[PDB]
Design a binder for these strands. Structure first.
Lengths: 152, 260, 178
RNA sequence: UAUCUGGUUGAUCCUGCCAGUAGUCAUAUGCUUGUCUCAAAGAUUAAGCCAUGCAUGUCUAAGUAUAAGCAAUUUAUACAGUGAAACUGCGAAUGGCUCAUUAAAUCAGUUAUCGUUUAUUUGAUAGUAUACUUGGAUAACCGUGGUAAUUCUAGAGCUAAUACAUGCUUAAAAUCCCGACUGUUUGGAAGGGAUGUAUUUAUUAGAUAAAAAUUUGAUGAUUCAUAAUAACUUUUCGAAUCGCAUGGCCUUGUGCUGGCGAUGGUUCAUUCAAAUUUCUGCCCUAUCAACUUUCGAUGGUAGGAUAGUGGCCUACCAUGGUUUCAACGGGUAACGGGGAAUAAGGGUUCGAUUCCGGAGAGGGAGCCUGAGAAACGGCUACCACAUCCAAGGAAGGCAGCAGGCGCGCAAAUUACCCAAUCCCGACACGGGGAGGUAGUGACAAUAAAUAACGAUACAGGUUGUAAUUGGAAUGAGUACAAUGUAAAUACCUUAACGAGGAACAAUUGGAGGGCAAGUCUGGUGCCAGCAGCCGCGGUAAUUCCAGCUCCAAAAGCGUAUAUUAAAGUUGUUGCAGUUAAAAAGCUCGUAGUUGAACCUUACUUUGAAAAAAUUAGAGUGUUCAAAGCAGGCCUUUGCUCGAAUAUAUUAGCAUGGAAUAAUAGAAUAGGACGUUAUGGUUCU
RNA sequence: CGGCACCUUACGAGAAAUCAAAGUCUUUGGGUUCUGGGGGGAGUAUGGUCGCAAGGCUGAAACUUAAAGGAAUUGACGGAAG
RNA sequence: CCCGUCGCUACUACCGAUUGAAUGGCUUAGUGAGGCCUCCGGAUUGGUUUAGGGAACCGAGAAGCUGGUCAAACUUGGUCAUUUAGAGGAAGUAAAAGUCGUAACAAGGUUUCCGUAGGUGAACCUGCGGAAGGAUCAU
RNA sequence: GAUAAGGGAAGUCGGCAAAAUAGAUCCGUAACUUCGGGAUAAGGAUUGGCUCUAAGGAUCGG
């Protein structure tokens, strides 16, 4: 079983640490969810202490918040376009935190009226933890940096 | 190892229970409850080893299963119930009321009190913080949570709980000159007044306490329990000896004169 | 498991097994006090050696020390109580001057013999072993029972002993019943 | 008791070892063994292998009862008492065993969680915008079975829940959004939606240096507690449960209301815990000097994963990290520690083993359930062993208790019991090889028999005996009996029996020196043998083999090994180096150590801390003692001292002192004060 | 003042020979480096390392043994002197 | 008194062809059980449940399947460590004092010893340079 | 000039003849040594097509 313990590693001085004890359940690990875009499908996992986690295998819509107006609406997302960790996630449309996605602009447009059809977002939720792809809308210098990176 | 322990070896039991070495292999492991494991007294030890009303564990279990023993105004049938500091145990069948207060020798004295005094108890305020719906509450030393406290109440104060409604009768502010009992360390059971409090940010605050015999000692703030508004005015009856520490030679002289 | 029960040795043997001066002093002292063997002398020397060690430890400490005063007074009081040390030598300097014959003076065998209940010291030992002598109202059949000063006046024959008002023994009852 | 003595020489003084000597909670073994108390015991070699049996189950008035179980007719024709079987709940992750691995790993003291999970116990905490109370399965059960074989189960017919899946019942306001109409100086509004609690985002409170031109908690510290706004959610749960009593109001209804309890439930706190974590400290080895980084090694950014921090993992990017102050590697006949032996002091050796922490269940690995396991008296798989078979197949894990084989120098009964100590369960009641009791037990420890007293006869200096003459005493043993105990055994008491060679018989080693005690008698004749060492023995052997006598310790004495003292022969205290062993051939030199005088720390005092057990030590007539933590009072329908205390010691914490020993300061002044010095630039 | 030494004494040291240091060391501590732990086996074997080689530096164990050795005394002996 | 070859006997260790052997640990590579996650899959089995013959369409859901992850075990290779065989070679020690001599101790009959290099049955001899621990503290 | 079941040098004076290996990238590499070598030692892994990604430059403009 995948574990997090530092026993398997070697010391800072380089010494190969010997075999102390067998692997323990209280340090295990599990596989990445690799959230995709598709009909909302979540699996609940039995964690330590009786808590429950929700793998977001694939999702379609999540709530996104416009920081300038303090408005949060549930809206569709097109796909991920920029990921600081790995470009394979951008290529394969894997939804993780700190990943730039494009969202449907219809609810924000309709709220603006009442008060290119796709807006940029940064997912702040952790889909492999909660099962929701919730994020905010880029504005200002964050927007400028991500757009420079996208256009190049 | 794989989960919580449920046994207590006799040799590993707290020394203030005063259990004998050869009476068996194990000692009563106190249950979870209002008081910490190391600072409590299980009712089997109190009712059998101290008062000697019961001669053995079958009898302490028969006693408690007949609904005789009450701790802090509620009937307990758990033979390993963790009775602790300042708790009131009432046995109205024998018409006896006890209060668990440390004597100056470090042990829990057998201190009988009247029913009127057995109608309340004191608790040291450990923390003040906000509960759900923004309602402040106070946690005392026996794990009690009292809602809607006096807005003047802060940490390290002592409140007097009515013990029948669970409400706060009145409180004592932590300040210089207050009467204090020490609830930890080698000064366990001693009573004195605060002379000067020495603070150490990021560490442990130290309290200087003066005995009734003008003996001065220093102890950690976590071991200080305020029991009175001034010298000679405790809010509970003190055990026999009045918390005055005598040297071993003085104790030897006193025992010699008392016994002839 | 259960807690261990403490035990300790009550004697120590000499380093040189064969030494005519020590062998003769021990044998002469055993003959004087009617002892069974040398281990009873090793026992006396051991307990006096640790009384001396305690006194030496207190004497190296400064005078008026609270600990020196407390344990020294307790040790002196115990020695006067058990009759080994005289009432005029309560100074913790005469304890070091104490000698094994002082302890051997206070044995039950010695006190019975010096009280006349026996013809000789060996008669004293056999009288003790045969359950004839009682101290107070309690029969003691241990010859090494160290008699305290307050127990000294209450040494006499057991009330149910043939020599102390009891019935005739096996031999006498067998003789007079024929 | 801070101790020495024999052996090199013709003789001497030395160095120096060999030998002697004593202990061992230190093992084996030989001979011997009467009593009381106490008590270790298959660790060492093989973490080698296991037949058999047991060691974990559990119900209260209070989950589910149509047993075609028992019992009686009774306040009862829905059941109602007791109560198997099953379903449900909880426990089975405790205990017990062992010490293979393991050398910054475990562990010890000291820290942290503002870095997390937490069944249970104990406190608080929830009116949230068909109801006289919802469904359909299933067990046990009945009767059809298949296999040689297992705690294997399949069809068919039932039936229940605090099991499974669903669902209303309710205060009073108040607030917010959308908003037809309306007022029309910016207000009023019908009608629609939303309010509790959980989840996930985003954004705001969450203040607090003193005069002139209304609220706001805690901390050393937070983006903490908590609140608000906009939304979100295969929408968390805000009791469709169970026992006893049956009361109150009459507008004569199976009307409306309600008392003590079981169990359950969200969140917060508490407790029992867990997991990471700071500082300092581990044995031998250099014939181990460089190690770590492919394929994570050190760090940065982002993510994933986790209960959470963290290269724990991934992607990208830097080249870092440890080391002669010993890194890395190797060895360990190495679990760490509390502690044990010996010891003037300092030390040396040991610690498998009664307690704490860790790890494991033949070796690995992977997991389910659960709050908690990488569990093995749970499962899956491989390797090695190993059981039945009808050869189609099936079942294992004693380093638990007892027991068997092997291994060996080395270690006991396949016994009785839950009575005590405690633990588990729905529990006053069941269970517990945990534990207690007895058996074997010269591992060690305590006390302590094997005789005592007269008279003669002699010897003898008023009395010690050597012999033959007496009357007394007694327990070892045997036993009525009582006590003891769950029942016994044993102990303690106690009728009757029980001693003259009181045969109811004390042994083990020795007698040249070391070393205490023969130059006695017989045997052999450099043989046999003894002898730790020196030596003895070749025809009067103080030394061999025996008899006599004697010496030492004695229910114990001898032998082997290891270790400690002796050993100032491991020397810091405290060795030696011209010639006994030993100054590098001679200089330079880095780390290390040490450093003339003078006006930030280290050091030292005190406090807190260092678990219990152990040690020392106070008290206390277990008949004494080893021990134990008891006990004592004129005899008590109760009175009443106690169970001290020291010591721990490196590291960390607080404190007083400023010698001793370091460290910093004003030389291109880049120096100090102006407290209310004069102006200028800013910030709150 | 610095050197190379020497002569006498022994307060003192040492087992002694002897020593102005080999003294100021059981009345034991000025600073510092190296080496030895009975005699042999043995500076051997093995591994490493330096050297063209000879060899150098580092460096055991099995086994065996009660002495080996230091200074001095008396004697005996000397193909040593008087 | 004493040294050493050589001969006999016994014991210990070393070197040694045998690409010697055996046992245990770590590991590259290959094969790879099993569990877990994921992806479809959909035996049968209830109805959101609708239908005058019944046509549907919703949920649960077994086997199985795809791709990953942790990874036992076996084969090969490497390496470390510990035991062990070996023709022969060269030593050491003990026993007895067997053969040959007399190297050392006296000026030991050539003073001895140290380093080095040759030679020789053996002790040893010789060269060169040192030392006195010399047989001289001296002309 | 090719191929061949099972065995794999038993054929023969003799592995004669044939077979096997083979490029490149990456890993790993012994005795011995004249220190230069031995060495391509030995022994392993990968390799197509397609769709992408990243890195590596020149000339002008202050």
């Amino acid at each position: 079983g995948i574990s997090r313990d530092s026993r398997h590693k070697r010391s800072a001085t380089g010494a190969k640490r010997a075999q102390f004890r067998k692997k323990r359940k209280f340090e295990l690990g599990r596989q990445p969810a690799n959230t995709k875009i598709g009909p909302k499908r979540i699996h609940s996992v039995r964690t330590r202490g009786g808590n429950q986690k929700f793998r977001a295998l694939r999702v379609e819509t999540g709530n996104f918040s416009w920081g300038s107006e303090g408005v949060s609406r549930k809206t569709r997302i097109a796909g991920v376009v920029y990921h600081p960790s790995n470009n394979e996630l951008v290529r394969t449309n894997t939804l993780t935190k700190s990943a730039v996605v494009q969202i449907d602009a219809t609810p924000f447009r309709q709220w603006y009226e009442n008060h290119s059809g796709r807006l940029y977002a940064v997912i702040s939720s952790r889909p492999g933890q909660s099962g929701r792809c919730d994020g905010y809308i880029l504005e200002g210098e964050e927007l400028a940096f991500y757009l420079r990176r996208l256009t190049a | 190892a794989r989960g919580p322990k449920k046994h207590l070896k006799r040799l590993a039991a707290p020394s203030h229970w005063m259990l004998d070495k050869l009476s068996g292999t194990y000692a009563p492991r106190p249950s979870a409850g209002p008081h910490k494991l190391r600072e409590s007294l299980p009712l089997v030890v109190f009712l059998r080893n101290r008062l000697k009303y019961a001669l053995n564990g079958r009898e302490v279990k028969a006693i408690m299963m007949q609904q005789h023993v009450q701790v802090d105004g509620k009937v307990r049938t758990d033979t390993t119930y963790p009775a602790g500091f300042m708790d009131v145990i009432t046995l109205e069948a024998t018409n006896e009321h006890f209060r668990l207060v440390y004597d100056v020798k470090g042990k829990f004295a057998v201190h009988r009190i009247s029913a009127e005094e057995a109608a309340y108890k004191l608790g040291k305020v450990k923390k003040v913080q906000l509960g759900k719906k923004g309602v402040p509450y106070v946690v005392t030393h026996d794990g009690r949570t009292i809602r809607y406290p006096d807005p003047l109440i802060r940490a390290n104060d002592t409140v007097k709980i009515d013990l029948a409604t669970g409400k706060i009768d009145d409180f004592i502010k932590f300040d210089t000159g207050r009467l204090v009992m020490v609830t930890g360390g080698r000064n366990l059971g001693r009573v004195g007044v605060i002379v000067h409090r020495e603070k150490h940010e990021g560490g442990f605050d130290l309290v200087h306490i003066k005995d009734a015999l003008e003996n001065t000692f220093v102890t950690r703030l976590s071991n200080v329990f305020v029991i009175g508004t001034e010298a000679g005015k405790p809010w509970v009856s003190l055990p026999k000896g009045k918390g005055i520490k005598l040297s071993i030679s003085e104790e030897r002289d006193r025992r010699r004169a008392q016994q002839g | 498991p259960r807690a261990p029960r403490t035990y300790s040795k009550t004697y120590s043997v000499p380093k040189r097994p064969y030494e005519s001066a020590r062998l003769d002093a021990e044998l002469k002292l055993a003959g004087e006090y009617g002892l069974k063997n040398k281990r009873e002398i090793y026992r006396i020397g051991f307990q006096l050696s640790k009384i001396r060690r305690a006194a030496r430890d207190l004497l190296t400490r400064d005078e008026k020390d609270p600990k020196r005063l407390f344990e020294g007074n307790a040790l002196i009081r115990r020695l006067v109580r058990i009759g080994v040390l005289s009432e005029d030598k309560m100074k913790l300097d005469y304890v070091l001057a104490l000698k094994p014959e002082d302890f051997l003076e206070r044995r039950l065998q010695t006190q019975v013999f010096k009280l006349g209940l026996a013809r000789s010291i060996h008669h004293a030992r056999v009288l003790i072993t045969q359950r004839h002598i009682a101290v107070g109202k309690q029969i003691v059949n241990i010859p090494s029972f160290t008699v305290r000063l307050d127990s000294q006046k209450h040494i006499d024959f057991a009330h149910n002993s043939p020599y102390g008002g009891g019935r005739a023994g096996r031999v006498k009852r067998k003789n007079q019943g024929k």
